[PDB]
Amino acid sequence: ILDKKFHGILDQGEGVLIIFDEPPVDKTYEAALETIQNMSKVVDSLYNKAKKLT
Amino acid sequence: RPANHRQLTFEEIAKSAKITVNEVELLVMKALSVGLVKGSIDEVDKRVHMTWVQPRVLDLQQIKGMKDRLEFWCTDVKSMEMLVEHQAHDILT
Amino acid sequence: LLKLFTTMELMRWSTLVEDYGMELRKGSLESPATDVFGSTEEGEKRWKDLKNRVVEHNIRIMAKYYTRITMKRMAQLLDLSVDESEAFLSNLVVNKTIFAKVDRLAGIINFQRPKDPNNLLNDWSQKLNSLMSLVNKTTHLIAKEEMIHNLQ
Amino acid sequence: NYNKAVEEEDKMTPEQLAIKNVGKQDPKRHLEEHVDVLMTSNIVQCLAAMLDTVVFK
Amino acid sequence: AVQKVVVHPLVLLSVVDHFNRIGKVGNQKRVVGVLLGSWQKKVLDVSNSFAVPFDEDDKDDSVWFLDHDYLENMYGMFKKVNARERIVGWYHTGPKLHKNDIAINELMKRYCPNSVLVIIDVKPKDLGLPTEAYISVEEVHDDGTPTSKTFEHVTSEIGAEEAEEVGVEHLLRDIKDTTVGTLSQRITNQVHGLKGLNSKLLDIRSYLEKVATGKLPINHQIIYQLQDVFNLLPDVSLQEFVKAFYLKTNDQMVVVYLASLIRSVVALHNLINNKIANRDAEKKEG
């Protein structure tokens, strides 16, 4: 699991291993991380703002 | 029954169909071979599930009293069309 | 044989013993029985390859009604035990012909499809199949309407 | 996926708006063509989300 | 097994000027003509037609007039202008049928693999589709009579081939391409909702007149077997789409996640550079 050769969940209580996985969602990932970059760029425009003001 | 609970229990089947619990499975797999109904029958609850069927030949009293579905459909999808359009009324634009 | 090839019609295996074993009780040609089931360490493997037929082909006829079954009911339908069930589950899961997933937290498991693997496919299948049906509807309801209102 | 793959080069423009004082001849404007596509395309998607609740009743 | 054709309304303007002929020649009120063309596939295209001088008695309605002075030598003309655009069918107005249509079809069926009686629309106010096709059919019955020939609804559309908009889209002078989702969708909502539900009123016309004063195709074989398809989901209280409501949360998932994320980027889009242009204009106007 820690080397990603095996994607699932083990158990000790009921003793039931269960394999499943679904990592990639670029609808979330690519969009929101590019919005983080967008917000960094808007912070870079905050000095055009703070320059036109004062 | 037009209504839901289309995950029907096997009970009416084994009562009125003169069949047993070990043979409801054959009763609907032979119907899969027939091909007029193709249920996704439950087998953890033993429930005989209802999917699409081949309905009837004639229900002339329900050819007359299908208004409670047809005119139901007509005036209610019409009214809700008028309601969607009436909430988005003045963006006629 | 051929009636056992289409849906396999979940018969009694001792009626298979009747059919495929009273061929030695033939006052005629027994050379079919001699060539097929007169063999012992090949013909006995054919008898149990036909037990492999009942499990194999009847899992392929029972593959419809799953996503919900326990294990005892699968023993009560495969016409064999739970131990013969688990041995056949073993050799057919290493077959891995259709994607199985079996588990004994309580035993409600089965041979299965990939277990409804998708999101919006349900919207696609259900609503677009049913609604493109409902858009073909009006296009041939005008058909029926004109053809019946030619006369009345 | 179009509307992300072109949005990263859309946001390669405000870095070019950081010209610290002024070092750019006129706005060279690439704001548009990703307002309108998003606008009408997701209007289509939200009214498509309407469409099942419309046709069904 | 024919779905759709491609329609040039150019010879429908020939239908228009023969609709100008019939208003000033005499007793012939309806426009009846002959539809040339060429089977290409299940999809098809039409480039020319012509309009017969036709009369039809009100008494014993099987009285056709399709002159072979007007068919054979005009067919020589239409063959001389092109070998490709030959016969494919004919056309008359109204929506329904008159009686003699079957024999008018079978007249020119001897020339064509499948002659088509596309019933045409000169004064369009209809609720469904424009002009629509009918193919040769042998469906007879489950009863086994002598073979039925009443040409069944084997549909059509108005397809668009190619350029012609030198004429057409200069002749528009009014219309606009709606950037879809700009009340184009509610034009469609109006037309398909209202015009499919009063098509459902045509269906209640069927399902009321064929109940009160309507016989033999009352449950023909396709009324009840399609009341099946009507019985996809007609149910009583709220029809309980119990799977489909969390599945509709799974639907609304994608839409309003793009709304939140993407329309917040739209907020960033308009707002940040709008403040740039705005406040620059504002105080750099000093």
Swiss-Prot record, chain A:
Q: Where in the cell is it found?
A: Nucleus; Cytoplasm, Cytosol
* Entry PTM: Phosphorylated by AMPK.
Give the intrachain disulfide bonds. Answer: none
Q: What induces it?
A: By FOXO4; expression in embryonic stem cells (ESCs) is mediated by FOXO4.
Describe, from its UniProt entry, the tissues in which this protein is expressed: Highly expressed in embryonic stem cells (ESCs). Expression decreases as ESCs differentiate.
What this chain does, per the entry, is described as: Component of the 26S proteasome, a multiprotein complex involved in the ATP-dependent degradation of ubiquitinated proteins. This complex plays a key role in the maintenance of protein homeostasis by removing misfolded or damaged proteins, which could impair cellular functions, and by removing proteins whose functions are no longer required. Therefore, the proteasome participates in numerous cellular processes, including cell cycle progression, apoptosis, or DNA damage repair. In the complex, PSMD11 is required for proteasome assembly.
Q: Summarize the subunit comment.
A: Component of the 19S proteasome regulatory particle complex. The 26S proteasome consists of a 20S core particle (CP) and two 19S regulatory subunits (RP). The regulatory particle is made of a lid composed of 9 subunits including PSMD11, a base containing 6 ATPases and few additional components.
Q: Which family does it belong to?
A: Belongs to the proteasome subunit S9 family.
The molecule here is called: 26S proteasome non-ATPase regulatory subunit 11
**Intact protein stretch covered?**
369 to 422 of 422
From Swiss-Prot, chain C:
Q: What is this protein called?
A: 26S proteasome non-ATPase regulatory subunit 12
Q: Which disease is it linked to?
A: Stankiewicz-Isidor syndrome: A neurodevelopmental disorder characterized by delayed psychomotor development, intellectual disability, behavioral disorders, mild dysmorphism, ophthalmologic anomalies, feeding difficulties, deafness, and variable congenital malformations of the cardiac and/or urogenital systems.
User: Which keywords does the record carry?
Assistant: Acetylation, Intellectual disability, Isopeptide bond, Proteasome, Ubl conjugation
What is this protein for, i.e. what is its function? Component of the 26S proteasome, a multiprotein complex involved in the ATP-dependent degradation of ubiquitinated proteins. This complex plays a key role in the maintenance of protein homeostasis by removing misfolded or damaged proteins, which could impair cellular functions, and by removing proteins whose functions are no longer required. Therefore, the proteasome participates in numerous cellular processes, including cell cycle progression, apoptosis, or DNA damage repair.
Residue ranges annotated for the PCI domain, each copy included: 1-116
What subunit structure does UniProt give?
Answer: Component of the 19S proteasome regulatory particle complex. The 26S proteasome consists of a 20S core particle (CP) and two 19S regulatory subunits (RP). The regulatory particle is made of a lid composed of 9 subunits including PSMD12, a base containing 6 ATPases and few additional components. Interacts with ERCC6.
The chain residues annotated with the modification N6-acetyllysine are K64
UniProtKB/Swiss-Prot annotation, chain D:
**What tissues has this protein been observed in?**
Widely expressed. Highest levels in heart and skeletal muscle.
**Chain positions found as Phosphothreonine:** T13
Q: Which domain of life is it from?
A: Eukaryota
What the protein does comes down to: Component of the 26S proteasome, a multiprotein complex involved in the ATP-dependent degradation of ubiquitinated proteins. This complex plays a key role in the maintenance of protein homeostasis by removing misfolded or damaged proteins, which could impair cellular functions, and by removing proteins whose functions are no longer required. Therefore, the proteasome participates in numerous cellular processes, including cell cycle progression, apoptosis, or DNA damage repair.
- Report the family membership: Belongs to the peptidase M67A family. PSMD14 subfamily.
Q: Subunit structure of this entry? A: Component of the 19S proteasome regulatory particle complex. The 26S proteasome consists of a 20S core particle (CP) and two 19S regulatory subunits (RP). The regulatory particle is made of a lid composed of 9 subunits including PSMD4, a base containing 6 ATPases and few additional components. Within the complex, PSMD4 interacts with subunit PSMD7 through their respective MPN domain. Interacts with TXNL1.
Protein name (record): 26S proteasome non-ATPase regulatory subunit 14
* UniProt organism field: Homo sapiens (Human)
Parent protein range shown? 254 to 310 of 310
UniProtKB/Swiss-Prot annotation, chain E:
Swiss-Prot/TrEMBL keywords = Acetylation, Isopeptide bond, Proteasome, Ubl conjugation
Q: Where is the MPN domain?
A: 5-140
Record bears the keyword Protein transport: no
What terms describe the molecular function in GO for this protein? protein homodimerization activity
Known InterPro entries for this protein? EIF3F/CSN6-like_C, JAMM/MPN+_dom, MPN, MPN_RPN7_8
The cross-references to PANTHER family, in alphabetical order and at most eight, read: 26S PROTEASOME NON-ATPASE REGULATORY SUBUNIT 7, EUKARYOTIC TRANSLATION INITIATION FACTOR 3 SUBUNIT F-RELATED
What is this protein called in UniProt? 26S proteasome non-ATPase regulatory subunit 7
State the organism of origin: Homo sapiens
Q: Lineage from the top down?
A: Eukaryota, Metazoa, Chordata, Craniata, Vertebrata
Primary gene name: PSMD7
